[PDB]
Every structure is written in structure tokens, then in C-alpha cells.
Amino acid sequence: DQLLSYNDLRHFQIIWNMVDDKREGVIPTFRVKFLLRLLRGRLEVDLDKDKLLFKHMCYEMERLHNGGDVTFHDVLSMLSYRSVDIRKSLQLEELLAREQLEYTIEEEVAKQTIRMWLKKCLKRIR
């Protein structure tokens, strides 16, 4: 339950084979955000009630390539990080780089939320 077993890994490769149908190995620009919308089962995450982690994962998916493509060896390692408790099961260089990335990406999503709120004030006033 703390780590992804073979049933959850099998569910991830079924949903990867079902979302990538054109058989070359990549996910294109148009369909990177539509990948985690239908993950259910033992990794049940919905559109509501988990919005902060939703926007956090949504910003983690579009930071390492500056948009565009994500490959078959990046996203599963990041979910493998996110699906386990990282406080006592991680080492010092990786934990320190992980908490620095977590702090700077939390600061960046705070900037993004206050920026879209400023946009919302622009459209509300005018």
C-alpha cells in the first residue's frame, strides 16, 4: 500500500498503452495534461477534494521540459516519489534536493495562483 505493487504498475502500463496509441514512445504537446484525469482504483484521485496536490502535480508535469514532451522514464519516477512518504525513507543528498525543489515549486505555484487571481481581478473589474 505504501509502494506501487504489480497490480498498480499493471494498471499504469494499461493506461499508458491506452493513452498512447500511435506507437512511437512519446506523449505529444496536446495530451500531457489528460494523463492523470482517469487514475482510479487503489490510486484513487478525483477532480475535487485534492486540489492542492492536483495543481502541484500539474506544475511538476510541465517544469522539467518547459512544455512539450515527457518520456517513458520520467513521469513514473516522479509518481513513485509522490506515492511514498519521503520523510524517513530517503537519503540526504536526494532529500535535500527534493525539499529544495518542493519549496521552490511551492513558491512557484503560489506565484502562479496569485497571478491567475490577478488575471481574475482584471476580468472582474473591466
Partner: peptide, 26 residues
């Protein structure tokens, strides 16, 4: 944040110096 990599860099750096002084003192 980045006070870890500099330690291993200066470790291999002082390894290169002790290799150099070992090759030239004898």
C-alpha cells in the same frame, strides 16, 4: 542546498594533489 557536491569535488581535487606530490617527490 549545494554544500554537498563541493565536498566531493574538493575530495577528488585533493586526491589529484596527493597523486601529484606522490609522483614528483620520489
Amino acid at each position: 542546498e549545494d554544500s554537498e557536491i563541493k565536498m566531493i569535488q574538493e575530495k577528488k581535487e585533493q586526491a589529484e594533489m596527493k597523486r601529484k606530490v606522490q609522483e614528483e617527490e620520489l
